[PDB]
Ligand binder design. Structure first.
Ligand SMILES: Nc1ncnc2c1ncn2[C@@H]1O[C@H](COP(=O)(O)OP(=O)(O)O)[C@@H](O)[C@H]1O
Ligand SMILES: Nc1ncnc2c1ncn2[C@@H]1O[C@H](COP(=O)(O)OP(=O)(O)O)[C@@H](O)[C@H]1O
Ligand SMILES: Nc1ncnc2c1ncn2[C@@H]1O[C@H](COP(=O)(O)OP(=O)(O)O)[C@@H](O)[C@H]1O
Ligand SMILES: Nc1ncnc2c1ncn2[C@@H]1O[C@H](COP(=O)(O)OP(=O)(O)O)[C@@H](O)[C@H]1O
Ligand SMILES: Nc1ncnc2c1ncn2[C@@H]1O[C@H](COP(=O)(O)OP(=O)(O)O)[C@@H](O)[C@H]1O
Ligand SMILES: Nc1ncnc2c1ncn2[C@@H]1O[C@H](COP(=O)(O)OP(=O)(O)O)[C@@H](O)[C@H]1O
Ligand SMILES: [Mg+2]
Ligand SMILES: [Mg+2]
Ligand SMILES: [Mg+2]
Ligand SMILES: [Mg+2]
Ligand SMILES: [Mg+2]
Ligand SMILES: [Mg+2]
Lengths: 309, 309, 309, 309, 309, 309
DNA sequence: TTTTTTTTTTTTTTTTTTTTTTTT
C-alpha cells in the first residue's frame, strides 16, 4: 500500500534520524517526499546536506513527475466506493462514497447527518463483494453525539457479529481546536500498523466558532482552518482512505453553510440535506467535479439509512 | 469522579499560580486540560513555560486519546437516568432524563414546563434504587416563577422530610444577560465541594429579548448566547450532571421557538409541549440522537406530574 | 426597602455623577445594579473607567448571589395581598392581588374591569389588618373614562374621608405611545420620595391599536410594547408595588385578548371576565404559577364590587 | 519555431558546455539570449570569457534591436486563437484565448473555471480551420480535481478518438510550491522534443496560501510568486504557447481575487465569473489593453461548455 | 538644432578619433562637451594631450557661461507643448507636456497609463498650430502591452493616414535590465539623423523587480537605475524632446509608486491616476516646479483620450 | 569693500606678474594673501624671489594676526541679514539669512527648497531698511528647474520693477563636477567688478552620485567635494556675501541626507524641511553654533513663502 | 592612512423577528 519509512536508512542515514522524523510526525516515505525543505530544516538536529540526501532518496523511492492521462485513468478505475445502505443515494453519487477525496454534508438540525456516518462506520468492514472495504474505522467527535447502541443494530442487519463490529472501531473526543489538530498525528501513527478504510470528523466548525470571537480574529481563524484541511487531505493521499466531515448553517439577514471561502474551496464534494414528511429526508448535490445537479429521497429506520417504504 | 486541581503542583509550580488559576474560574484538572493556551495566556502572571508545564501535567493526569468502541459502550452502560414522575414519559424517554447532555423543553404559555422542572428538582435526590440521583439541585430563574410551596407537596408525595428537601436546592435570580453569564463561575466553584446532580435554567432567552433590540444588534446577541451554551456543556462534561433549560415561542407571519440556529444546533434533546383537555398535556420528541419520534399524554396534579387518571 | 442612590459617593464619585444619573432616570441603587454596562455608557459624561466603579459599588449594597430555597420560602411568606371587595374573588385568588408581580384582567365591554380598578384604587389605602395596602395609588388612563364620583362613593362605603381620599390618588392621561412610556420616568421620580402601594394601567393596548397600522409595522409595535412591559416589572422589583393592567378582546374568526405572545408570556397571572344576569358577573383563572383553574361570581353595585345578593 | 541550443557550439564551445547548460535548465538559444550575464556566470564549470562569447553568438541568431510598428503589426496579425466552445465568449474576447500572453480566470466556487480548462484541453488538439491548436496539453494540478471521464465525453463531442485524446495530455500533481516551481524545468525539457500548444495551472495560488503564513512572511511570498510568473512569461516567449491559470477569491471585510499587485500587474487579461440560473453563468471582462468592458452568458452541459439554448 | 560632431576635427584631430568616439557612444559636439575628462580617458586609442584639445575645441561651439535671467526668460518662451487630447488636462498642465523635461505617470492596474502613452504617440506629428510637434516617437516596451490597432483608431480622429502614423514610430522590446540600458545608445544614434520629438518608456521598473532579489542586492539595483535616468536627461538636454515614463505601485503594509528616492528626485513632473465611474478617470498633480495642486477628469474611448461627454 | 589687486604693483613687481595672478584665478589682494607659498608656484612666471616679495606685500594691506573679542563683536554687529518673507521663518533664524556663511537645506521631494531660493533671489534687491542688500544674483543650476516666471510674480509683492528685477540676475547651468568647480573662477572675477549679495548652488550633490559610482571610487569623490566646499567658503569670506545650497536624502536599511561627514562638518547652518497639510510645510533647525533647536510652520503661495495665512 | 550606500509586500465573514378581524 505504502513505502515504509525504514527503507530510507542508506548512504549515511542512521536510526537516530528516522527516530527524530517519527517523533516529528512523519511515519512513511510519502510524508517525507511531500514536505518542503524549510519544514525539515525546522526539525531539531536535521541540518543541510542531510535534508538533500533525505529528499533525494525519498524521491527515488516515490515518483513525482509526468505520466499520461491514460495511466491516471487506469489507476482510477480501481478505487473502492463505500455503500450508504440506500439505493437512491448510491445511484445519486455514482456508486457511493469514494476513497481519496473529501465529502461534506450540511443542513439544519435533525436532517440525518450523523445517522449516515454511523451506517458507514459499519459498512466499511464487510467484504468487498457487497460494497465494503474490509477495514477499520476512526471516529473523531467534537459534539458528543456518538452511540454504539445504533452500531449493534446496524451490525445485526448486515450479518456481522456484534463483538467484532464494535472491536474494529476506534473513538476519540475533542475539546478545543488545538486538540483537534493534535489528534491527527496519533491517527497517522496508528494507521501504519494495520489497515483502515474511513475517517470521520463530526463536525468541523463547531469549536472554531467560539474560540475566535468577532471581527479582529477572522484572519487567524481562517488560517487555522486552512491548516487543518490541508492535513486531512495529506492523510487521504498517504493512506488511500475515505474522509467524511459535517457542517452547520446560518441565516442570511434562506440559509447557508458557515466557514467562508476557505471551506467552500477546500471540499471536493458537497451535499445538502432537507427535512421531509415523516421519517423521509431529501438530499441534493451542490458541488462536484464529475456529477450533475439532482435530488433524491431517503429514510431513517431502526437499522440505519434506507429507501422509502 | 473528577481529579482535584491541587495535584498540578509538581515540577516547581507554586500555590500562587494555582490560586490565580482558581480566581480565573478553573477548579478541576479537567478544566485546565480542556482549555486552549490562549485563554491561559490572557491571564496575568502566566508565561509560556508555566502554561506548557500546566498543560503537560494535566494531559498526563487526564486521558485524551483513542479507545475502542467496546470500552466506550461498557462505560456508557453505567450512566444513570432520572425519573420524571410519569410512566408514559419515562417509557418515551428510554428511562428518564440522562446525565451528560442537555435537554430543552418548549411550548406556549401554561403548558407545564415550570412544573416539570419543579418535580425534577425534587426527584433528583431520592435513593438510586427507585430512580433518583442522590444529590443537590441548582436553580437559575430569570422571570420570577419559582415557588417552594409546590416542592413541599411534591416532596410529601415521595416520602421525604420537607426541610431536607428544601435545604438541598440552591436558588439564584438574574436581572440581565451579563449577570446570567457571571453566575456560572460561582456555580462551578460551588460544585467542586459537594455532590450535585442537576442544573435548571428557566427561560434562557427571556432577558436577551430586550437587552439587544432590532437588526443592528443581532450578531452580538447571538455571540453572547453561543458563549453561554458552551459554558453549560463544559460544566456537564466536567461534573457529569444533567442540565435542563426552558424556552419561549413566537408566531410565524404556526408557532416556533426563538433563538435561531445557535440554539437549534447546540441542544442534545428537544421536547415540545401542548395543551390538552382539562388538566392533561401532550408531549412530543422533536430531536434526539438515539430515539424515534413519538407522542405521549401526561397530567398535572396538586402533587406534581403524573399519569392520566 | 429601596436604598437611596446617594450612597454611591464613597470613592471618586461626586454630586454631578448622581445628577446626570437622575437626569437619565435612575433613582436608587437597585436601578443601577440591575442595569447593563452598555446602558451606563450612554449618558453624556460617563464615558468609561467610571461605569465599572459604579458597578462594583452597589454590589455590596444590593444583595446578589445564590441562596437556599428555605430562606426564600421565609422571605416570600411575608407579602401583602389587597382585597378585591368580594369574598368569592378573594377565596379564588388565594388571598387577594399580590404585590411584586403582574396581574392581567381581560373581558368584553361593560364586563366590569374598570369598576374593579376603581375599587382597588380605594382599597389600596386602608390599614393592613383589614386587607388594605396603606399607601398611595398611581392611575394611568388611555380612554378618558376616569370618573371621580365613583371614588367618593366607594370611599364612603369603606369609611374613609372623601377629601383625604381624593388627594391620595395620582391621576394621569396619555395621548400616544411615546407619551405613555415617558410618564413612567415621572412615576419613578414620584415614587422616589413618598411611599406608594399600587399602579393601575387602563388600558395597556388602546393606543397601540392605532399608532401602528398594517402588517408593515407589527415588528416595531411588539418591540415597543416589549420595552414597556419590562419597565413595569422593574418598578415592582424596586419599591414592591402591585401592578394591575387592563386589556381588550377580539373575535377569533369565541374571543381572545390582544397583544400576542409578548403579552401572553410577560404576564404572571391572567383573569377572564364574562357577563352574568343583571348586575352579576363571572370570573375565571386562565393562567397561574401556583393555582388550579376555578370559577367564581361577583356583582357590581353603587359602591363598587361585592358579592351577589 | 525555435532555434536549437546545439547551434551554440561553433568555435571555442564544446559539447560539454552545452551539456552543463542543459543540466542548468536552458534548452534553446532564446533562453541564452534573454539571460543576464550574472545568471550565466553561476553554473559551475562556466568561466568568464565564455559567457561573453555565448551572448555574442546568441545575439546573432536571435534578433534584439529596433523595428518599425508596421512590421510588428503584420507579425501580430499572423497569430492563432483557441475556441472555447461558446460563441458568446468568442465574440466577447475577439476570437478567443490567444497564444503568447497570460489570461486569468477568477470567481467563487462552482462557477466553472475547471470545466473551461477541461474543454480547452480538448479544443487545443483539433485542426486549425475550426479554432484548434494542433498541439498537446500540459496540466499542472495543485487541488486534485482532474477527471479523465469528462475528457472522454468532451472528446466524443468534438469528434476525436478517446484513446489518442488520453495519450496526448500530460498530467502532474504538485505537493508544495518548490515542487511546483521545479516542474517547469521538466516542462521546458518536454516542449523542446515535441510540439505543444497549451499550458494550464489549476490553481496558481492554492499552495502559496499555506506554505507562507502571516504578515512576517508576506514579502518572501510575493517574491517567490514573482519568479514563477516571470518563468511562465518566458515559456510563452520561447515556444509560443497559450497560458491559462486559475485563481480564487476572498471577501472585502464585495469579493476580490487573491494575489495582490504582483498578480494584478503580471496578467495580460482578466475575466470574472458569476453564477446564473440553473446551468448558466455570466462572464465579464475586467482588464485588457485593447478591449472594452462588456458581459455575456454561457452554460455547462454534459459535453463541456456551450451556448445557453 | 544641434552641432554635428564632424566639426570637432579641425587641427590635430583625425577621422579615426571621431570614429572611435562614435563607437564609444557619442554622436554630437554637446555630448563631448558635457562629458568629464576621466571617462574620455577610457576609450582605447585615446591618449592624453588630445582630451584637453577636444574639451577646448568644443567649449567655443557650445556656449557654457553666465547669462542674464531676462535672456533666459525670452528663451523659455518659444517652448513647445503637446496636447494630451483633452481640454481639461491641457488646462491643468498649462498647455501640454513640455519638451526638455521628464514627466512621470503612475497608478494601479487599468487606470489609463498605457492609453495616454498611445495617444501621445500620434499628436507628436500633427502641425504646430493645433498643439502638434511634427516629429517622431521612440517607444520602449518591457511588458508586452503595445498594440498598433489603438494607434490606427486614434490617428483617424486627428486626420492622418494610418500608414504614415505607423511608419513614424520605432518600437523595441527588452528582456532584462542590461538590454534596456543597451538600447539607449542605438536610440541616441537614431535621433542624430532625423527629427524626433518624444520618448516613451513603458514600464521603467518592471524588469528591475526580478533581476535583483532581496535585501542583499538593493544597492546594486539602485545604482544601476541612476545611470538610466541620467542618460535620459542627457538625451533631453541634447536634442530637446519630451520624456514620458510609467510606473507601478505597491501596498503600504494606501498605495505608492516603486523606485525609492532615486526615482522620486529625478523626475520633473509627477501625475497620479485613479479609477472613476464607467469610462471616467481622475488625474492629480503631485509634484511640479511651477504649478499648484489641482485635479481634473478625462475619459477613455475607442478613439483615445478625451473629455467626459 | 576690499583691496583691489592692482594696488600691489610696487618696486620689483610689474603689470605682467599681476596679470599672471589674475589669470591663475587670483582677482584680489585677499586672494593673494589667502594662498600658501606652495600654492603660488604652479603659476608660470614666478619661481622664487617673487613669491616672498608678494607675500610680504599683500599682508600690510590685509591684517593677519591677533585682535580682541570686542573688536570682532563690533565688526560682526554690522552684518546684514536677508529676509525670508515669512515672519515665523524670520523669527526662527534670528532675523533672516545671514551673510558670510553657508546655509544648507535638505528634505524629501517637493518640500519647498527651490521656491525659497527663488524668493531669496528677488528679495536680495530690496532696500536695506526692510531687510535687503541692494545687489544682484548669481544662480548655478545642476538639476534644471529654474523658472523666471516665479521671479516675475514675486517681484510685484515687494514693489520692484519687473524688467529691472529680471535684469539683475546671472544664470549658469552645470553639466558635471569639473564644470561645476570651474564656474567659481568666473563667478569671483565677475563679482570683483560690481556689488553682489547672493550666490546659489542648487543642488550640490546631484552630479556626484553617478560620476563616482560604487566602492573603490569612494575616497576620491570626497576629496573633490571637500575642495569645492573650501572654494565656496573662500569666496564668501572674500566678498562678504551669502551662499545657499540644497541637498537630497536616502533611506536607512527614517531618511538622512547624502554626502557623508565632509558635508556635515563643512556646512555652517543645516535645516530640515517636511511636508504638511495642503500647502503648509514644516521647518526645523538641525545645526547652528548660536541658535536653539525649534520647529516652525510656513506655507507656499503664488507670491512666495509666507506665514500660515 | 582615507572614506558611506540603499527599500519590500495584502489578508479575511457574521447573524432573525412578529398577529389581525364579524356577518344576517
Ligand atoms: N433508534 C432510532 N430509530 C429511528 N429513528 C431514529 C432513531 N434514532 C434517531 N432517529 C432519527 O434520527 C434523527 C436524528 O438525526 P441526526 O442525524 O442525529 O441529526 P443531525 O443531522 O443534527 O446530525 C431524529 O430526528 C430521529 O427521528
Ligand atoms: N396546584 C396546582 N394544581 C393543579 N394545577 C396547577 C397547580 N398549579 C399550577 N397548575 C397549572 O399549571 C399551569 C402552569 O404551568 P407552568 O409550568 O407555569 O407553565 P409554563 O411554565 O409553560 O408557563 C397552569 O395552567 C395551572 O392550571
Ligand atoms: N353608578 C352606577 N350604578 C349602577 N350600575 C353602574 C353604575 N355605573 C356603571 N354601572 C354598570 O357597571 C358597568 C361598568 O362598566 P365598565 O366597568 O366601565 O366596563 P369596562 O370594564 O369595559 O370598562 C356598566 O355596564 C353599568 O351597567
Ligand atoms: N457531467 C456533468 N454534467 C453536468 N454538470 C456537471 C458535470 N460535472 C460537473 N458538473 C457541474 O459543473 C459545475 C462546475 O464545477 P467546476 O467548474 O469544476 O468548479 P470551479 O469553477 O470551482 O472549478 C459543478 O457545480 C457541477 O455541478
Ligand atoms: N477599445 C477600447 N475601448 C474602450 N476602452 C478600452 C479599449 N481598450 C482598452 N480599454 C480600457 O482601458 C483601460 C486601461 O487600459 P490601460 O491604459 O492599458 O491600463 P494601464 O495603462 O494601467 O496599463 C481598461 O480598463 C480597458 O477596459
Ligand atoms: N505658482 C505656484 N503656486 C502655488 N504652489 C506652487 C506654485 N509653483 C509651485 N508650487 C508648489 O511648490 C512645490 C514644489 O517645491 P520645490 O521647490 O520644487 O521643492 P524641491 O525643490 O524641494 O523639490 C510643489 O508641490 C508645488 O505644488
Ligand atoms: Mg444536529
Ligand atoms: Mg409561561
Ligand atoms: Mg370598555
Ligand atoms: Mg473550486
Ligand atoms: Mg498595467
Ligand atoms: Mg525636488
Amino acid at each position: 500500500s505504502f513505502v515504509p519509512i525504514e527503507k530510507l536508512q542508506v548512504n549515511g542515514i542512521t536510526m537516530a534520524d528516522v527516530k527524530k522524523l517519527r517523533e516529528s510526525g512523519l511515519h512513511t516515505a510519502e510524508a517525507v517526499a511531500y514536505a518542503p525543505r524549510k519544514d525539515l530544516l525546522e526539525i531539531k538536529g536535521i541540518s543541510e546536506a542531510k535534508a538533500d540526501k533525505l529528499l533525494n532518496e525519498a524521491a527515488r523511492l516515490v515518483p513525482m513527475g509526468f505520466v499520461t492521462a491514460a495511466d491516471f485513468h487506469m489507476r482510477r478505475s480501481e478505487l473502492i466506493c463505500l455503500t450508504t445502505g440506500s439505493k437512491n443515494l448510491d445511484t445519486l453519487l455514482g456508486g457511493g462514497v469514494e476513497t481519496g477525496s473529501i465529502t461534506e454534508l450540511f443542513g439544519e438540525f435533525r436532517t440525518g447527518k450523523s445517522q449516515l456516518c454511523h451506517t458507514l462506520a459499519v459498512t466499511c468492514q464487510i467484504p468487498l463483494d457487497i460494497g465494503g472495504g474490509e477495514g477499520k474505522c476512526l471516529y473523531i467527535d467534537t459534539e458528543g453525539t456518538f452511540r454504539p447502541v445504533r452500531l449493534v443494530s446496524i451490525a445485526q442487519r448486515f450479518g456481522l457479529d456484534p463483538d467484532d463490529a464494535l472491536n474494529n472501531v476506534a473513538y476519540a473526543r475533542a475539546y478545543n481546536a488545538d486538540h483537534q489538530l493534535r489528534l491527527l498525528d496519533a491517527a497517522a501513527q496508528m494507521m501504519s500498523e494495520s489497515r483502515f478504510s474511513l475517517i470521520v470528523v463530526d463536525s468541523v466548525m463547531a469549536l472554531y466558532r467560539t474560540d475566535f470571537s468577532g471581527r479582529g480574529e477572522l484572519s487567524a481563524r481562517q488560517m487555522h482552518l486552512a491548516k487543518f484541511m490541508r492535513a486531512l487531505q495529506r492523510l487521504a493521499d498517504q493512506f488511500g482512505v475515505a474522509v467524511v466531515v459535517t457542517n452547520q448553517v446560518v441565516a442570511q439577514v434562506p440559509k447557508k453553510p458557515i466557514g467562508g471561502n476557505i471551506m467552500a474551496h477546500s471540499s471536493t464534494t458537497r451535499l445538502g440535506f432537507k427535512k421531509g414528511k415523516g421519517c423521509q429526508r431529501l438530499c441534493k448535490v451542490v458541488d462536484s467535479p464529475c456529477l450533475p445537479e439532482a435530488e433524491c429521497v431517503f429514510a431513517i429506520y431502526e437499522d440505519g439509512v434506507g429507501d422509502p417504504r
